[PDB]
Amino acid sequence: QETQGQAAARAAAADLAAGQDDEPRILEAPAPDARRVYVNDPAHFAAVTQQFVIDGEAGRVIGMIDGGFLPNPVVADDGSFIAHASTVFSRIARGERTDYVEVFDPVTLLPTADIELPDAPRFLVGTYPWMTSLTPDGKTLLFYQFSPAPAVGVVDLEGKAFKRMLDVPDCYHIFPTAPDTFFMHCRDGSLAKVAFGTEGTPEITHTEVFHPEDEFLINHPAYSQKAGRLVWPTYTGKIHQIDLSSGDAKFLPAVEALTEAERADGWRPGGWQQVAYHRALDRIYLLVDQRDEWRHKTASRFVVVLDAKTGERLAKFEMGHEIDSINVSQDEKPLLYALSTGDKTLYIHDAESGEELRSVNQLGHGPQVITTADMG
């Protein structure tokens, strides 16, 4: 029941009473672990933004990272580093644009690489986790470009240099599967495999169309690079699962997150990060609520949990708050993270019981994106 602030007050009183000296210094964040959670605040399109580095178990902010206009955060699964692609201007929001990649040490938070992206090539959009992506080996960062056309930038983090833009078809999002390979979702309804050697035009293969034109796949699918699992829900909560572990796309049996009776009762997924995927447990988590069909970006008060293999519901939680985004830790007995944009608060739940354990408030102006490293 003793809060972190109270324990700190007693320790400081004990130090003063015992005459214990200590040097004012710059703290190091604790070593990255399974329970570390990052919360990004795109700040409702503000020119500058903030990332919050949080200890999930303590419910404590252990560090922060400044960003520019709608940055894309990435977190290496092995915990070795974090990074973002960011955007600044020479006069706040006006003048010369500089797009750039920064890599940070994950305990000092110090920038270890600052890589300028030529010709201001970043896609400026409400933050989608998979618009910027690390390759599994972590030596390459891939970012999406919309203007003048869909394109994918190759950033070498090892050599700390921009390499080139890749011409792609009318496709969206970046799901890396190998050092030289990533998948995209295309307007025509297919996925595009993009294989890029160190030189030339990439080899682009399409799969067969896997969803009809009238079936809308959300902007925030879950992707486990280590499982090669792409979990893509539709506006109705229908869930597409694609296995990419063999290096090619294999379409798993489609599953419904809601029942037909619930769908008729107006139950629909809604929010920002509406889906989480736990790799070890092979488990899908979805933000749902009762809502009109075009209120798809509003907060949801419920989470449903289903077996990815069979699509049986394992649980349904009443979250107790207006939740926009969810994610989970990738350790055993995982935490369920429930982020409220409206409350600016990360709510930390036990993923098994759905019970609220603790919370971290005051997370910016409009926090939206939760990132966890898969370290196991």
Partner: protein
């Protein structure tokens, strides 16, 4: 009377007696079977039309007469932008002032003067009847009055529902009578969200009562010379088409190289394209706009030639603000635009789509 005036213009429109050697009428270059354009293959293909002498070619593509009646008289609006008038360069104030000009154009119908026109009208008993009933006795004996009256009949004729029926698929879909296909709806959506609607819509905002897919403004979109058409024109390789700057009274150097925004109605059936008919295909006309947006090497290449588009005839006054939109049209979006523009075809021209 307004019916009779049009009826008179209907006669004059198909009358070769208004050409010097009586070989051509308005209908010769504005063929009612080809949306009032010219089907005849000349020294430069369909880019430019042959006059009454059988040899002379123009330097400009013959435009449709469909919906020309909806264009306001030439004027300068409060923003300083010139709007309206007739001809690719707006040198005519309106349909009336324009009508007599092809008649006296030596590279076109080639009548020596108004007197010669009057003499030809006077030779026709039905014209003496038709003109005098509308304009008074002895009208045809006065070359000035006869010429002006003929101009008014043709203008009146051009203003009938027949030239502007508004019965295209677009028009029917906008009356809730049918739906666009998936591809057509995409095309329309692209058209109104991309830079197209900045010049090819009547109004900046609101809904037009009679849309003709032109704001009537003048723009230099940086087109190259049409080599063979310029050759056929006989105006010389030294010649520069200065567009709107050619209108008498227009002195402003910022208007050099600017041309009237054409109406896109019947665009699918009125190729070749642009003021000099340089592009034979509709898809090419669309793809041209990618040269200002796309960074792909293929955007610099005219697909009809496999060579670079070519330098602008007039390198200044380009509408860069509008043209450099930051977004490239992919092949899917080009397909969609073609599909949408095809819906701007009048009912009677729908069989021409194949």
């Amino acid at each position: 009377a307004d019916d009779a005036l049009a009826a008179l213009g209907a006669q004059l429109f198909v009358d070769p007696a208004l050409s010097r050697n009586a070989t051509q009428s308005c209908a010769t270059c504005h063929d009612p079977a080809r949306a009032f354009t010219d089907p005849r293959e000349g020294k430069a293909g369909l880019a430019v039309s042959v006059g009454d002498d059988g040899q002379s070619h123009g330097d400009r593509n013959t435009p449709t007469l469909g919906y020309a009646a909806l264009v306001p008289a030439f004027h300068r609006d409060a923003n300083g932008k010139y709007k309206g008038g007739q001809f690719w360069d707006g040198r005519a104030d309106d349909l009336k002032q324009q009508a007599g000009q092809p008649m006296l154009n030596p590279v076109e119908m080639a009548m020596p003067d108004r007197a010669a026109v009057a003499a030809r009208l006077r030779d026709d008993p039905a014209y003496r009847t038709g003109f005098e009933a509308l304009f008074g006795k002895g009208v045809l004996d006065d070359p000035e009055r006869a010429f002006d009256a003929a101009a008014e009949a043709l203008a009146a004729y051009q203003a009938t529902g027949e030239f502007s029926p508004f019965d295209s698929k677009y028009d029917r879909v906008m009356r809730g009578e049918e739906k666009f296909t998936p591809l057509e709806e995409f095309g329309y959506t692209v058209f109104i969200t991309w830079n197209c609607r900045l010049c090819h819509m009547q109004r900046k905002q609101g809904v037009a009562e009679r849309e003709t897919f032109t704001n009537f403004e003048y723009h230099n979109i940086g087109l190259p010379v049409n080599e063979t058409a310029r050759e056929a024109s006989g105006l010389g390789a030294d010649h520069v088409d200065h567009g709107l700057l050619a209108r008498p009274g227009i002195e402003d150097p910022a208007q050099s190289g600017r041309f009237k925004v054409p109406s896109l109605r019947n665009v699918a059936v009125t190729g070749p394209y642009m003021h000099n008919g340089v592009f034979t295909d509709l898809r090419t006309a669309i793809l041209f706009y990618n040269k200002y947006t796309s960074r792909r090497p293929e955007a610099k290449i005219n697909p009809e030639t496999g060579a670079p588009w070519g330098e602008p005839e007039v390198a200044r006054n380009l509408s860069l603000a509008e043209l450099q939109s930051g977004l490239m049209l992919d092949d899917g979006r080009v397909d969609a635009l073609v599909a949408f523009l095809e819906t701007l075809t009048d009912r009677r021209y729908e069989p021409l789509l194949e």
